[PDB]
Design a protein around this ligand. Structure first.
Ligand SMILES: *[C@@H]1O[C@H](CO)[C@@H](O)[C@H](O)[C@H]1NC(C)=O
Ligand SMILES: *[C@@H]1O[C@H](CO)[C@@H](O)[C@H](O)[C@H]1NC(C)=O
Length: 400
């Protein structure tokens, strides 16, 4: 959609690039909300209305084709990100799910480079990504996410998408969702927005999930028909890594009887371990809390390969069929090597209550506990804070 006249004021976020020899050196980044989270309205001199909701093509009246859509639908800048529950403070990003005044912005943001006109492209195969988190205000059924998508570096800036990454265009993920704009262009044919997606962190105070998701396409792929479905071009489920799913129940939770005590802050380390040829083989997750390294659990479950890392053997074993079929750990590594955009969000699940994250085989949460009607009784204002985003050499990102 065409940029409007309102000023876009991106929050500044200091991050780090890490080496063994040089330590953690600070870098300037900016934060941008998803393009379709910006106010989108019909152009000056057109009757008021919308340019499409999540799940829909754009409207036939103002968007019969890409060129009409590009002039009739206006994306306004957001001059005050706090109205959408997005604030930064030095090296800290705070995402508020619900504001004090009752609004539910459920924000999703991307990391821009210091120009504000191109995503920071992370190339993590053979490297580590680390962050500090406060998960205390995330009950059952909340998802705090920190992940990568294979979005176009400029948000697919183009003649009819002049806004680009500066307005957060070009979002995609392994769900192949229909959005009224894809690559900042009217999705006239109502296709899905597919790409490789690496879920570094999907967690609340009750459960922690890591999951790579493969697609058999490079970059953002516009899917039609069966391509968007479970047997299509992307892996919707991913290869899930969660202590609970591998029958380890005392690793992560609220209080001193868990190794990672989600009542206090902690650090999350993710290593992308490659072979001599630069192909990804293992994803290693471990934590640091109160100045001490908490090594990963080993799997503890009959029929599951005994491992402390994600790899092809574990993924095949645990039923991740589309993950293996659409490129497996090597394919995921190739997307990570091409470069990905960092996305950070907070959301809840009216339909499923996020049961796949923290319920049953995945955690300690009862049926219905994760329903939004119950979340607000446990925590009226859910929020997450990510602090000191930092990536670089294996073993360089953490102290003690
Ligand atoms: C920034 O964070 C620190 C907590 O470290 C707090 O002292 C400070 O008041 C915060 N700044 C703003 C503007 O909220
Ligand atoms: C699950 O965990 C406990 C180990 O504490 C063990 O008794 C049980 O056999 C394990 N179950 C499976 C299905 O591996």
């Amino acid at each position: 959609q065409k940029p409007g006249e309102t000023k876009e004021v991106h929050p500044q976020l200091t991050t780090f690039r890490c080496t063994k020899r040089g330590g953690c050196k600070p870098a300037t980044n900016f934060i941008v909300l998803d393009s379709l989270s910006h106010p989108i309205h019909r152009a000056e001199g057109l009757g008021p209305g919308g340019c499409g909701d999540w799940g829909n093509p754009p409207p036939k009246d103002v968007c019969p084709d890409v060129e009409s859509c590009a002039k009739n639908c206006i994306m306004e800048g957001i001059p005050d990100y706090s109205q959408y529950g997005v604030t930064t403070n030095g090296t800290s990003l705070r995402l508020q799910h619900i504001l004090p005044d009752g609004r539910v912005p459920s924000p999703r943001v991307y990391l821009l480079d210091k120009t504000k006109r191109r995503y920071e492209m992370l190339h993590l195969t053979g490297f580590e990504f680390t962050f500090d988190v406060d998960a205390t205000k995330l009950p059952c059924g909340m998802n705090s996410a920190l992940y990568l998508s294979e979005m176009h570096p400029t948000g697919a800036k183009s003649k009819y998408n002049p806004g680009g990454a500066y307005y957060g265009t070009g979002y995609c993920d392994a769900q192949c969702f229909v959005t009224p704009f894809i690559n900042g262009l009217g999705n006239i044919e109502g296709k899905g927005s597919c790409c490789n997606e690496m879920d570094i962190w999907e967690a609340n105070s009750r459960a922690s999930h890591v999951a790579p998701h493969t697609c058999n396409k490079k970059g953002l792929y516009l899917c039609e028909g069966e391509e968007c479905a479970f047997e299509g071009v992307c892996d919707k489920n991913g290869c899930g890594w969660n202590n609970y799913r591998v029958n380890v129940t005392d690793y992560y939770g609220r209080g001193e009887e868990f190794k990672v005590n989600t009542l206090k802050p902690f650090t999350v380390v993710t290593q992308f371990l490659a072979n001599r040829r630069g192909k990804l083989e293992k994803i290693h997750r471990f934590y640091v809390q109160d100045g001490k390294v908490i090594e990963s659990f080993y799997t503890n479950k009959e029929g599951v390969p005994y491992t402390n890392m994600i790899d092809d053997e574990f993924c095949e074993a645990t039923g991740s069929r589309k993950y293996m079929e659409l490129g497996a750990t090597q394919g995921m590594g190739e997307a990570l090597t091409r470069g990905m955009v960092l996305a950070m969000s907070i959301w809840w699940d009216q339909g499923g209550n996020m049961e796949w994250l923290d319920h049953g085989e995945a955690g300690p949460c009862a049926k219905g506990e994760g329903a939004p009607s119950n979340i607000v009784q446990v925590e009226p204002f859910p929020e997450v804070t990510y602090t000191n985003l930092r990536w670089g050499e294996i073993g360089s990102t953490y102290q003690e």
